[PDB]
Design a protein around this ligand. Sequence first.
Ligand SMILES: OC[C@H]1O[C@H](O[C@H]2[C@H](O)[C@@H](O)[C@@H](O)O[C@@H]2CO)[C@H](O)[C@@H](O)[C@@H]1O
Ligand SMILES: [Zn+2]
Ligand SMILES: [Zn+2]
Ligand SMILES: [Zn+2]
Ligand SMILES: [Zn+2]
Ligand SMILES: [Zn+2]
Ligand SMILES: [Zn+2]
Ligand SMILES: [Zn+2]
Ligand SMILES: [Zn+2]
Length: 366
Amino acid sequence: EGKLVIWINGDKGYNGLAEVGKKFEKDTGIKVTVEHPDKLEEKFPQVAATGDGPDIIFWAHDRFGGYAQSGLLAEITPDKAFQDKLYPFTWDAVRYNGKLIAYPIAVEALSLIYNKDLLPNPPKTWEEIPALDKELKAKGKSALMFNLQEPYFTWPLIAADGGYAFKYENGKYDIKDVGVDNAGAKAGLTFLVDLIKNKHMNADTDYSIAEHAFNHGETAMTINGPWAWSNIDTSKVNYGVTVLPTFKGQPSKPFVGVLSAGINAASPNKELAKEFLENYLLTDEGLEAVNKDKPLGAVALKSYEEELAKDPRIAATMENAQKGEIMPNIPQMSAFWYAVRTAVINAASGRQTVDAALAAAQTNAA
Ligand SMILES: OC[C@H]1O[C@H](O[C@H]2[C@H](O)[C@@H](O)[C@@H](O)O[C@@H]2CO)[C@H](O)[C@@H](O)[C@@H]1O
Ligand SMILES: [Zn+2]
Ligand SMILES: [Zn+2]
Ligand SMILES: [Zn+2]
Ligand SMILES: [Zn+2]
Ligand SMILES: [Zn+2]
Ligand SMILES: [Zn+2]
Ligand SMILES: [Zn+2]
Ligand SMILES: [Zn+2]
């Protein structure tokens, strides 16, 4: 009471967000503490269930349906004037059972990021990457490194030739129809595993390692979102942001997230949380503060987004988004993500075959 605690992931602009919080404190006397706990998306539903946790939680919209189903989120009530300020499709991402359960902030999609000095013309296909890696390994470089620990990053390849999460049918997802074990999913994961077994990639590679390699010019390419650009800017690597490579002639299909801010149902500061989000954060100046720390991607706020749209990196982001699909927000997404995380880790490390890993994933996801 009389305080705001906010959780946002450590890869986002939490210092920029904190600057908005300082402005809020200056105006209102309400202190705002921004934190970035590890695994906050799993931590929230645990501590919020007891009525603890943050006043406001930031995460991609996919997790919010489950939070809402658990009664963990307060229903938000922006009026017409405010809703008209954000793109309709962003409001769509934070609707659950007819109710708005969060404020949309920004649209995120993975792109191919490449080093222009090592790779003036980036590959259009996944298939050519092994040969490119061999050429680079002769120079002590690698072609591509990206986070293999989180299925968010491998999904675009798995989905390329036909993998999918849950079948969409006329407004509803059929949670009994999962596409993680079909021929398309298997072809994509098999290709990934082949890269690893043949030493073009390392099963070990995680977010920090991939980011390190790209930003020090050790690898020619990486796969990451808008938040990553800030650190590359500092590294002085000459980079481009472009369309993900195709697989079997088909576009890579990233799962698109809408970074959203939910209010804890157990919060005694719901009115203040709304005031902060609507009138401090979701303004030209508020989003700019966060964006300048770590880029948000394409923001939900029309007035600022139409300025950001001039950025070819954002154009690239949305080109990839359009080839991909907006994540469902249904409660079953958590089971889906866990199933696929396990499958990719087990296949990549050789603990299971691709067929065995994905068969288990099909069961676990549904
Ligand atoms: O890997 C599964 C994971 O994917 C998504 O998480 C993304 C997040 O959306 C992005 O904002 C970014 O920060 O990277 C995360 C992956 O490390 C889903 O949103 C999440 O629920 C899911 O577990
Ligand atoms: Zn603390
Ligand atoms: Zn942290
Ligand atoms: Zn109003
Ligand atoms: Zn090879
Ligand atoms: Zn290891
Ligand atoms: Zn190094
Ligand atoms: Zn260094
Ligand atoms: Zn009120």
